[PDB]
């Protein structure tokens, strides 16, 4: 419902660089040809043809030096270019382009998608808009260093939803233990409860979810339904026929249930003080919340084996890595290097559950002010109908 006008509107140098890359590469016992290259908004991917035997892991363990052999902040070595037998070398463009939220929001890919948890990621290395469905993730983990784009990235996601879902479609439980990052959304009618600030309430909020999931699963059985979607259609049906479905377990009639998106900003604070208990709850939720319409988003900027633990990783299939400071950090996030080779400012590596190959995406950009604009627009439509007990 809010308007898009609340958001701002959107070969020689190459071959020379291709020739220097081939020169710096041959500068070692690495013979390779730059058979091709494709330029995008932020980087340019050079396709190298390694000589017989030359492992693609040989360049990867030399990205730092190589990036230094030329004048670029960093260089990313993609071991496998989908569809081609060549190795990829991503270099930053001299003139970078901003990827505007609005440009992706105004695309068919976002417009056509029926899911209310559709989110804009950004654009792929070739300039194509990338959208994703939180419902299909079905839970996500966002991580990076401080100003690499995680926060802006999360805002892009929520705004995505605020540009397609009515509260009846999606409700949020926002956990911001420390500071006020998510506090900017206070008042949004979508909020199920006030932004959670006490670390103990957080645990309670999660426990609520766990029960809300069993409740929804009970109902789904009574109607012989598999998804939350199938349940709502049964309910829509009952509505069209003015044949209200009375609660089979109990005046009182069943109603449409919204998707609940649980957002935890810097769940590191949640771990470094209530870790064990939280992990316990996250794991249970992440295992069966999908069909029940409950989805987790865990954001952090302190990617450590203490935060992104084994269990956490084992329960959150989809992960997003914004620029990190080291390979270790990246591996903790993606169980694979690469994110320490991004160019900051929204540059990211998406890693879904249905593939081992990560995908580079330049995150959409949203002004802190546009967030306020969008939030003000939503609060004018009315205040949130809080649900009691979530925090108690």
Coordinates of N, CA and C in Angstrom, one line a residue, residues 12-233:
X12 N 37.6 -0.9 -23.3 CA 39.1 -0.8 -23.4 C 39.7 -1.1 -22.0
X13 N 39.2 -0.4 -21.0 CA 39.7 -0.5 -19.7 C 39.7 -2.0 -19.2
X14 N 38.8 -2.8 -19.8 CA 38.6 -4.2 -19.4 C 39.8 -5.0 -20.0
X15 N 39.8 -5.2 -21.3 CA 40.9 -6.0 -21.9 C 42.3 -5.6 -21.4
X16 N 42.5 -4.3 -21.0 CA 43.7 -3.9 -20.5 C 44.0 -4.6 -19.1
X17 N 42.9 -4.6 -18.3 CA 42.9 -5.2 -17.0 C 43.0 -6.7 -17.2
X18 N 42.4 -7.2 -18.2 CA 42.4 -8.7 -18.5 C 43.9 -9.1 -18.8
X19 N 44.5 -8.2 -19.5 CA 45.9 -8.4 -20.0 C 46.9 -8.3 -18.8
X20 N 46.6 -7.4 -17.8 CA 47.4 -7.3 -16.6 C 47.2 -8.5 -15.7
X21 N 46.0 -9.0 -15.6 CA 45.7 -10.1 -14.7 C 46.4 -11.3 -15.2
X22 N 46.4 -11.5 -16.6 CA 47.0 -12.6 -17.2 C 48.5 -12.5 -17.0
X23 N 49.0 -11.2 -16.8 CA 50.4 -10.9 -16.6 C 50.8 -11.2 -15.2
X24 N 50.0 -10.8 -14.2 CA 50.3 -11.0 -12.8 C 50.2 -12.5 -12.5
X25 N 49.2 -13.2 -13.2 CA 49.0 -14.6 -12.9 C 50.2 -15.4 -13.5
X26 N 50.6 -15.0 -14.7 CA 51.8 -15.7 -15.3 C 53.0 -15.3 -14.6
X27 N 52.9 -14.3 -13.7 CA 54.0 -13.8 -12.9 C 54.4 -14.8 -11.9
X28 N 53.6 -15.9 -11.8 CA 53.9 -17.0 -10.9 C 53.9 -18.2 -11.8
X29 N 53.9 -19.4 -11.2 CA 53.9 -20.6 -11.9 C 52.5 -20.9 -12.3
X30 N 51.7 -19.9 -12.6 CA 50.3 -20.0 -13.0 C 50.1 -19.5 -14.4
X31 N 49.9 -20.3 -15.3 CA 49.6 -19.9 -16.7 C 48.1 -20.0 -16.9
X32 N 47.5 -18.9 -17.3 CA 46.1 -18.9 -17.6 C 45.7 -17.8 -18.6
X33 N 44.7 -18.1 -19.3 CA 44.2 -17.1 -20.3 C 42.9 -16.5 -19.8
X34 N 42.7 -15.2 -20.1 CA 41.5 -14.6 -19.8 C 40.6 -14.7 -21.0
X35 N 40.0 -15.8 -21.2 CA 39.2 -16.1 -22.3 C 38.0 -15.2 -22.5
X36 N 37.5 -14.6 -21.4 CA 36.4 -13.7 -21.5 C 36.2 -12.9 -20.2
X37 N 35.1 -12.0 -20.3 CA 34.8 -11.2 -19.1 C 33.4 -10.6 -19.3
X38 N 32.7 -10.4 -18.2 CA 31.4 -9.8 -18.3 C 31.3 -8.8 -17.2
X39 N 31.0 -7.5 -17.6 CA 30.9 -6.4 -16.6 C 29.5 -6.2 -16.0
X40 N 29.5 -5.9 -14.7 CA 28.2 -5.6 -14.1 C 28.2 -4.3 -13.4
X41 N 27.2 -4.0 -12.5 CA 27.1 -2.7 -11.8 C 28.3 -2.5 -10.8
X42 N 28.8 -3.5 -10.2 CA 29.9 -3.3 -9.2 C 31.2 -4.0 -9.6
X43 N 31.1 -5.2 -10.1 CA 32.3 -5.9 -10.5 C 32.3 -6.3 -11.9
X44 N 33.4 -6.9 -12.4 CA 33.6 -7.4 -13.7 C 34.2 -8.8 -13.5
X45 N 33.5 -9.8 -14.0 CA 34.0 -11.2 -13.9 C 34.9 -11.7 -15.0
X46 N 36.2 -11.9 -14.8 CA 37.1 -12.4 -15.8 C 37.1 -13.9 -15.8
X47 N 37.0 -14.5 -16.9 CA 36.9 -16.0 -17.0 C 38.3 -16.5 -17.4
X48 N 39.0 -17.2 -16.5 CA 40.3 -17.7 -16.7 C 40.3 -19.1 -17.1
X49 N 41.1 -19.5 -18.1 CA 41.3 -20.8 -18.5 C 42.6 -21.3 -18.0
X50 N 42.5 -22.1 -16.9 CA 43.8 -22.6 -16.3 C 44.3 -23.7 -17.1
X51 N 45.7 -23.8 -17.2 CA 46.4 -24.8 -17.9 C 46.1 -26.2 -17.3
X52 N 46.3 -27.3 -18.0 CA 46.1 -28.6 -17.5 C 46.7 -28.9 -16.2
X53 N 45.9 -29.3 -15.2 CA 46.4 -29.6 -13.9 C 46.3 -28.5 -12.9
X54 N 46.4 -27.2 -13.3 CA 46.4 -26.1 -12.5 C 45.1 -26.0 -11.7
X55 N 45.1 -26.4 -10.5 CA 43.9 -26.4 -9.6 C 43.4 -25.0 -9.4
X56 N 42.1 -24.8 -9.3 CA 41.5 -23.5 -9.1 C 41.7 -23.0 -7.7
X57 N 42.1 -23.9 -6.8 CA 42.4 -23.6 -5.4 C 43.8 -22.9 -5.3
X58 N 44.5 -23.0 -6.4 CA 45.9 -22.4 -6.4 C 45.8 -20.9 -6.4
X59 N 44.8 -20.3 -7.1 CA 44.6 -18.9 -7.1 C 43.9 -18.4 -5.8
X60 N 42.9 -19.1 -5.4 CA 42.2 -18.8 -4.2 C 43.1 -18.5 -2.9
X61 N 44.1 -19.3 -2.8 CA 45.0 -19.2 -1.7 C 46.1 -18.1 -2.0
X62 N 45.8 -17.3 -2.9 CA 46.7 -16.2 -3.4 C 45.9 -14.9 -3.7
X63 N 44.7 -14.8 -3.3 CA 43.8 -13.7 -3.6 C 44.3 -12.4 -3.1
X64 N 44.9 -12.4 -1.8 CA 45.4 -11.2 -1.2 C 46.6 -10.6 -2.0
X65 N 47.6 -11.5 -2.3 CA 48.7 -11.0 -3.0 C 48.3 -10.5 -4.4
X66 N 47.6 -11.3 -5.1 CA 47.1 -11.0 -6.5 C 46.3 -9.7 -6.5
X67 N 45.4 -9.5 -5.5 CA 44.6 -8.2 -5.5 C 45.6 -7.1 -5.3
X68 N 46.7 -7.3 -4.7 CA 47.7 -6.3 -4.4 C 48.7 -6.1 -5.6
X69 N 48.7 -7.1 -6.5 CA 49.5 -7.1 -7.7 C 49.0 -6.1 -8.7
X70 N 47.7 -5.6 -8.4 CA 47.1 -4.6 -9.2 C 46.6 -3.6 -8.1
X71 N 45.9 -2.6 -8.5 CA 45.4 -1.6 -7.5 C 43.9 -1.7 -7.2
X72 N 43.5 -2.9 -6.7 CA 42.1 -3.1 -6.3 C 42.0 -3.5 -4.9
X73 N 41.0 -3.0 -4.2 CA 40.8 -3.3 -2.8 C 40.8 -4.8 -2.5
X74 N 40.2 -5.6 -3.4 CA 40.2 -7.1 -3.3 C 39.8 -7.8 -4.6
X75 N 40.0 -9.1 -4.6 CA 39.8 -9.9 -5.8 C 39.1 -11.2 -5.3
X76 N 38.0 -11.6 -5.9 CA 37.3 -12.8 -5.6 C 37.5 -13.9 -6.6
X77 N 38.0 -15.0 -6.1 CA 38.2 -16.2 -7.0 C 37.1 -17.2 -6.9
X78 N 36.3 -17.2 -8.0 CA 35.2 -18.1 -8.0 C 35.7 -19.4 -8.7
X79 N 35.8 -20.5 -7.9 CA 36.2 -21.7 -8.4 C 35.3 -22.3 -9.5
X80 N 34.0 -22.2 -9.4 CA 33.1 -22.7 -10.4 C 32.1 -21.7 -11.0
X81 N 32.3 -21.4 -12.3 CA 31.4 -20.5 -13.0 C 30.3 -21.4 -13.5
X82 N 29.1 -21.3 -13.0 CA 28.0 -22.1 -13.5 C 27.9 -22.1 -15.0
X83 N 28.0 -23.3 -15.6 CA 27.9 -23.5 -17.0 C 29.1 -23.5 -17.9
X84 N 30.2 -23.0 -17.3 CA 31.5 -22.9 -18.0 C 32.6 -23.6 -17.3
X85 N 33.6 -24.1 -18.0 CA 34.7 -24.8 -17.5 C 35.8 -23.9 -16.9
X86 N 35.6 -22.6 -17.1 CA 36.6 -21.7 -16.6 C 36.5 -21.3 -15.1
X87 N 37.6 -20.6 -14.7 CA 37.6 -20.1 -13.3 C 37.3 -18.6 -13.3
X88 N 36.6 -18.2 -12.3 CA 36.2 -16.7 -12.3 C 37.1 -15.8 -11.4
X89 N 37.4 -14.7 -11.9 CA 38.1 -13.7 -11.1 C 37.3 -12.4 -11.1
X90 N 36.7 -12.1 -10.0 CA 35.9 -10.8 -9.9 C 36.8 -9.6 -9.4
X91 N 36.8 -8.6 -10.2 CA 37.5 -7.4 -9.9 C 36.5 -6.2 -9.8
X92 N 36.8 -5.3 -8.9 CA 35.9 -4.1 -8.8 C 36.0 -3.1 -9.9
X93 N 34.9 -2.5 -10.3 CA 34.9 -1.5 -11.4 C 35.3 -0.2 -10.8
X94 N 36.0 0.6 -11.6 CA 36.5 1.9 -11.2 C 35.3 2.8 -10.8
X95 N 34.2 2.7 -11.5 CA 33.0 3.5 -11.3 C 31.9 2.6 -10.8
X96 N 31.6 2.6 -9.5 CA 30.6 1.7 -9.0 C 29.2 2.3 -9.1
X97 N 28.2 1.4 -9.2 CA 26.8 1.9 -9.3 C 26.0 1.5 -8.1
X98 N 25.1 2.4 -7.7 CA 24.3 2.2 -6.5 C 23.1 1.3 -7.0
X99 N 22.7 0.4 -6.1 CA 21.6 -0.5 -6.5 C 20.5 0.0 -5.5
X100 N 19.4 0.6 -6.1 CA 18.3 1.2 -5.4 C 17.2 0.3 -5.1
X101 N 16.8 0.3 -3.8 CA 15.7 -0.6 -3.4 C 14.6 -0.5 -4.4
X102 N 14.1 0.7 -4.6 CA 13.0 1.0 -5.6 C 13.1 0.4 -6.9
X103 N 14.3 0.3 -7.4 CA 14.5 -0.3 -8.8 C 14.1 -1.8 -8.7
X104 N 14.4 -2.5 -7.7 CA 14.1 -3.9 -7.6 C 12.6 -4.1 -7.1
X105 N 12.1 -3.2 -6.3 CA 10.7 -3.2 -5.9 C 9.8 -3.0 -7.0
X106 N 10.2 -2.2 -8.0 CA 9.4 -1.8 -9.1 C 9.5 -2.9 -10.3
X107 N 10.2 -4.0 -10.0 CA 10.4 -5.0 -11.1 C 9.2 -6.0 -11.0
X108 N 9.1 -6.8 -12.1 CA 8.0 -7.8 -12.1 C 8.3 -8.8 -11.1
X109 N 9.6 -9.3 -11.0 CA 10.1 -10.3 -10.1 C 9.6 -10.1 -8.7
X110 N 9.4 -8.8 -8.3 CA 8.9 -8.6 -7.0 C 7.4 -8.3 -7.0
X111 N 7.0 -7.7 -8.1 CA 5.6 -7.3 -8.3 C 4.7 -8.6 -8.5
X112 N 5.1 -9.5 -9.3 CA 4.4 -10.7 -9.6 C 4.3 -11.8 -8.5
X113 N 5.4 -11.9 -7.8 CA 5.5 -12.9 -6.7 C 4.3 -12.8 -5.7
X114 N 3.6 -13.8 -5.5 CA 2.4 -13.9 -4.6 C 2.7 -13.9 -3.1
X115 N 3.9 -14.3 -2.8 CA 4.3 -14.4 -1.4 C 4.5 -13.1 -0.7
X116 N 3.8 -13.0 0.5 CA 3.9 -11.7 1.3 C 5.3 -11.6 2.0
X117 N 6.1 -12.7 1.9 CA 7.4 -12.6 2.6 C 8.5 -12.6 1.5
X118 N 8.1 -12.0 0.3 CA 9.1 -11.8 -0.8 C 10.0 -10.7 -0.3
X119 N 11.3 -10.9 -0.6 CA 12.2 -9.8 -0.2 C 13.2 -9.5 -1.3
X120 N 13.6 -8.2 -1.4 CA 14.5 -7.8 -2.3 C 15.9 -8.0 -1.8
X121 N 16.8 -8.6 -2.6 CA 18.1 -8.8 -2.1 C 19.0 -7.7 -2.7
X122 N 18.9 -7.6 -4.1 CA 19.7 -6.6 -4.7 C 19.8 -6.9 -6.2
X123 N 21.0 -6.9 -6.8 CA 21.2 -7.3 -8.2 C 22.4 -8.2 -8.3
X124 N 22.3 -9.1 -9.3 CA 23.4 -10.1 -9.4 C 24.6 -9.4 -10.1
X125 N 25.7 -10.1 -10.1 CA 26.9 -9.5 -10.8 C 26.7 -9.0 -12.2
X126 N 25.7 -9.4 -12.8 CA 25.4 -9.0 -14.2 C 24.3 -7.9 -14.3
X127 N 23.9 -7.4 -13.1 CA 22.9 -6.3 -13.2 C 21.4 -6.8 -13.1
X128 N 21.2 -8.0 -12.9 CA 19.8 -8.5 -12.8 C 19.3 -8.5 -11.4
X129 N 18.1 -8.0 -11.2 CA 17.4 -7.9 -9.9 C 17.2 -9.2 -9.3
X130 N 17.6 -9.3 -8.0 CA 17.5 -10.6 -7.3 C 16.5 -10.5 -6.1
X131 N 15.5 -11.3 -6.2 CA 14.4 -11.3 -5.1 C 14.5 -12.7 -4.5
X132 N 14.0 -12.8 -3.3 CA 14.0 -14.1 -2.6 C 12.8 -14.2 -1.7
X133 N 12.3 -15.5 -1.4 CA 11.2 -15.7 -0.6 C 11.5 -16.2 0.8
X134 N 11.4 -15.4 1.8 CA 11.7 -15.8 3.2 C 11.0 -17.1 3.5
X135 N 9.8 -17.3 3.0 CA 9.0 -18.5 3.2 C 9.6 -19.7 2.7
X136 N 10.5 -19.6 1.7 CA 11.2 -20.7 1.1 C 12.6 -20.9 1.6
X137 N 13.0 -20.0 2.6 CA 14.4 -20.1 3.1 C 14.7 -21.3 4.0
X138 N 13.9 -21.5 5.0 CA 12.7 -20.8 5.5 C 13.1 -19.9 6.6
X139 N 14.3 -20.0 7.0 CA 14.9 -19.2 8.1 C 16.2 -18.6 7.6
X140 N 16.6 -17.5 8.0 CA 17.8 -16.9 7.5 C 18.8 -16.3 8.6
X141 N 20.0 -16.2 8.2 CA 21.1 -15.7 9.0 C 21.8 -14.7 8.2
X142 N 21.9 -13.5 8.7 CA 22.6 -12.4 8.0 C 23.8 -12.0 8.9
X143 N 25.0 -12.0 8.3 CA 26.2 -11.6 9.0 C 27.2 -10.8 8.2
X144 N 28.1 -10.0 8.9 CA 29.1 -9.3 8.2 C 29.8 -8.5 9.3
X145 N 30.7 -7.5 8.9 CA 31.4 -6.7 9.9 C 30.4 -5.5 10.2
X146 N 30.9 -4.4 10.8 CA 30.0 -3.3 11.1 C 29.4 -2.6 10.0
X147 N 30.1 -1.8 9.2 CA 29.4 -1.1 8.2 C 29.4 -1.7 6.8
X148 N 29.4 -3.0 6.7 CA 29.4 -3.7 5.4 C 28.0 -3.9 4.7
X149 N 26.9 -3.6 5.5 CA 25.6 -3.7 4.8 C 24.6 -4.5 5.5
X150 N 24.9 -5.2 6.6 CA 23.9 -6.1 7.2 C 22.7 -5.3 7.7
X151 N 22.9 -4.2 8.3 CA 21.7 -3.4 8.8 C 20.9 -2.9 7.7
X152 N 21.5 -2.2 6.7 CA 20.8 -1.7 5.5 C 20.1 -2.9 4.9
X153 N 20.8 -4.1 4.8 CA 20.3 -5.3 4.2 C 19.0 -5.8 4.9
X154 N 19.0 -5.7 6.2 CA 17.8 -6.1 6.9 C 16.7 -5.1 6.7
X155 N 17.0 -3.8 6.7 CA 15.9 -2.8 6.4 C 15.3 -3.0 5.1
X156 N 16.1 -3.4 4.1 CA 15.6 -3.6 2.7 C 14.6 -4.8 2.8
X157 N 14.9 -5.8 3.6 CA 14.0 -6.9 3.7 C 12.6 -6.5 4.3
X158 N 12.7 -5.9 5.5 CA 11.4 -5.5 6.1 C 10.6 -4.5 5.2
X159 N 11.3 -3.5 4.6 CA 10.6 -2.6 3.7 C 10.0 -3.3 2.6
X160 N 10.7 -4.4 2.1 CA 10.2 -5.2 1.0 C 8.8 -5.6 1.4
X161 N 8.7 -6.2 2.6 CA 7.4 -6.7 3.1 C 6.4 -5.6 3.3
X162 N 6.9 -4.5 3.8 CA 5.9 -3.4 4.1 C 5.4 -2.9 2.8
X163 N 6.0 -3.3 1.7 CA 5.5 -2.9 0.4 C 4.7 -3.9 -0.3
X164 N 4.1 -4.9 0.5 CA 3.3 -5.9 -0.1 C 2.4 -6.6 0.9
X165 N 2.7 -6.5 2.2 CA 1.9 -7.1 3.2 C 1.1 -6.2 4.1
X166 N -0.1 -6.6 4.3 CA -1.0 -5.9 5.2 C -0.7 -6.6 6.5
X167 N -1.0 -6.0 7.7 CA -0.7 -6.7 8.9 C -1.3 -8.1 8.8
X168 N -2.6 -8.3 8.3 CA -3.2 -9.6 8.2 C -2.4 -10.6 7.5
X169 N -1.5 -10.2 6.7 CA -0.6 -11.1 5.9 C 0.7 -11.4 6.7
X170 N 1.3 -10.4 7.4 CA 2.5 -10.6 8.1 C 2.6 -9.8 9.4
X171 N 3.0 -10.5 10.5 CA 3.2 -9.8 11.8 C 4.6 -10.0 12.2
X172 N 5.2 -9.0 12.9 CA 6.6 -9.1 13.3 C 6.8 -9.1 14.8
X173 N 7.8 -9.8 15.2 CA 8.3 -9.9 16.6 C 9.7 -9.4 16.5
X174 N 10.0 -8.2 16.8 CA 11.4 -7.7 16.7 C 12.1 -7.7 18.0
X175 N 13.3 -8.4 18.0 CA 14.1 -8.5 19.2 C 15.4 -7.6 19.0
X176 N 15.4 -6.5 19.8 CA 16.6 -5.6 19.7 C 17.1 -5.4 21.1
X177 N 17.7 -6.5 21.7 CA 18.3 -6.5 23.0 C 19.0 -5.2 23.4
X178 N 20.0 -4.8 22.6 CA 20.7 -3.6 22.9 C 20.6 -2.6 21.7
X179 N 20.7 -1.3 22.1 CA 20.6 -0.2 21.2 C 19.2 -0.1 20.5
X180 N 19.1 0.8 19.5 CA 17.8 1.1 18.9 C 17.7 0.8 17.4
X181 N 18.5 -0.1 16.8 CA 18.4 -0.4 15.4 C 16.9 -0.6 14.9
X182 N 16.3 -1.6 15.5 CA 14.9 -2.0 15.1 C 13.8 -1.1 15.8
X183 N 14.3 -0.2 16.7 CA 13.3 0.7 17.3 C 12.7 1.7 16.4
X184 N 13.3 1.8 15.2 CA 12.8 2.7 14.2 C 11.4 2.2 13.6
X185 N 11.1 1.0 13.9 CA 9.8 0.4 13.5 C 8.7 0.4 14.5
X186 N 9.0 0.9 15.7 CA 8.0 1.0 16.7 C 6.8 1.7 16.2
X187 N 5.6 1.1 16.5 CA 4.4 1.7 16.1 C 3.8 1.1 14.8
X188 N 4.6 0.4 14.0 CA 4.1 -0.2 12.8 C 2.9 -1.2 13.2
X189 N 1.8 -1.1 12.5 CA 0.7 -2.0 12.8 C 1.0 -3.5 12.7
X190 N 2.1 -3.8 12.0 CA 2.5 -5.2 11.8 C 3.1 -5.9 13.1
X191 N 3.6 -5.0 13.9 CA 4.2 -5.5 15.2 C 3.2 -6.3 16.0
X192 N 3.6 -7.5 16.5 CA 2.8 -8.3 17.3 C 2.9 -7.9 18.8
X193 N 4.1 -7.3 19.1 CA 4.3 -6.8 20.4 C 5.3 -5.7 20.3
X194 N 5.5 -4.9 21.3 CA 6.5 -3.8 21.3 C 7.9 -4.4 21.1
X195 N 8.8 -3.7 20.4 CA 10.1 -4.1 20.1 C 10.7 -4.7 21.4
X196 N 11.1 -5.9 21.4 CA 11.7 -6.5 22.6 C 13.1 -6.0 23.0
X197 N 13.2 -5.5 24.2 CA 14.5 -5.0 24.6 C 15.2 -5.8 25.7
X198 N 14.5 -6.4 26.6 CA 15.1 -7.2 27.7 C 15.5 -8.5 27.1
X199 N 16.7 -9.0 27.4 CA 17.2 -10.3 26.9 C 16.4 -11.5 27.3
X200 N 15.7 -11.3 28.5 CA 14.9 -12.4 29.0 C 13.6 -12.5 28.3
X201 N 13.1 -11.4 27.9 CA 11.8 -11.3 27.2 C 12.0 -12.0 25.9
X202 N 13.2 -11.8 25.3 CA 13.5 -12.5 24.0 C 13.2 -14.0 24.1
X203 N 13.8 -14.6 25.2 CA 13.6 -16.0 25.4 C 12.1 -16.3 25.4
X204 N 11.4 -15.5 26.2 CA 9.9 -15.7 26.3 C 9.2 -15.6 25.0
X205 N 9.6 -14.5 24.2 CA 9.0 -14.3 22.9 C 9.2 -15.5 22.0
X206 N 10.3 -16.1 22.1 CA 10.6 -17.3 21.3 C 9.7 -18.5 21.8
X207 N 9.7 -18.7 23.1 CA 8.8 -19.7 23.7 C 7.4 -19.5 23.2
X208 N 6.9 -18.3 23.1 CA 5.6 -18.0 22.7 C 5.5 -18.7 21.3
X209 N 6.3 -18.3 20.4 CA 6.3 -18.8 19.1 C 6.2 -20.3 19.0
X210 N 7.0 -21.0 19.9 CA 7.0 -22.5 19.9 C 5.6 -23.0 20.2
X211 N 4.9 -22.3 21.1 CA 3.5 -22.8 21.4 C 2.5 -22.4 20.3
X212 N 2.7 -21.2 19.7 CA 1.9 -20.7 18.7 C 2.0 -21.7 17.5
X213 N 3.1 -22.3 17.4 CA 3.4 -23.3 16.3 C 2.6 -24.6 16.5
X214 N 2.6 -25.0 17.8 CA 1.9 -26.3 18.1 C 0.4 -26.0 17.9
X215 N 0.0 -24.8 18.3 CA -1.4 -24.5 18.2 C -1.9 -24.5 16.7
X216 N -1.1 -23.9 15.9 CA -1.4 -23.8 14.5 C -1.3 -25.2 13.8
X217 N -0.4 -26.1 14.4 CA -0.3 -27.4 13.8 C -1.5 -28.2 14.2
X218 N -2.1 -28.0 15.4 CA -3.2 -28.7 15.8 C -4.4 -28.4 14.8
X219 N -4.6 -27.1 14.6 CA -5.6 -26.7 13.7 C -5.4 -27.2 12.3
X220 N -4.2 -27.2 11.8 CA -3.9 -27.7 10.5 C -4.4 -29.1 10.3
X221 N -4.3 -29.9 11.4 CA -4.7 -31.3 11.3 C -6.2 -31.4 11.2
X222 N -6.9 -30.7 12.1 CA -8.4 -30.7 12.1 C -8.9 -30.4 10.7
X223 N -8.2 -29.6 9.9 CA -8.7 -29.3 8.5 C -8.0 -30.1 7.5
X224 N -7.1 -31.0 7.9 CA -6.4 -31.8 6.9 C -5.6 -30.9 5.9
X225 N -4.8 -30.1 6.5 CA -4.0 -29.1 5.7 C -2.5 -29.2 6.1
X226 N -1.7 -29.0 5.1 CA -0.2 -29.1 5.2 C 0.5 -27.7 5.5
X227 N 0.1 -26.7 4.9 CA 0.7 -25.3 5.0 C -0.2 -24.4 5.8
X228 N 0.2 -23.2 6.0 CA -0.5 -22.2 6.7 C -1.4 -21.7 5.6
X229 N -0.8 -21.7 4.4 CA -1.5 -21.2 3.2 C -2.8 -22.1 2.9
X230 N -2.7 -23.4 3.1 CA -3.9 -24.2 2.9 C -4.9 -24.0 3.9
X231 N -4.5 -23.6 5.1 CA -5.4 -23.3 6.2 C -6.2 -22.1 5.9
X232 N -5.5 -21.0 5.5 CA -6.1 -19.8 5.2 C -7.1 -19.9 4.0
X233 N -6.9 -20.8 3.1 CA -7.8 -21.0 2.0 C -9.0 -21.7 2.5

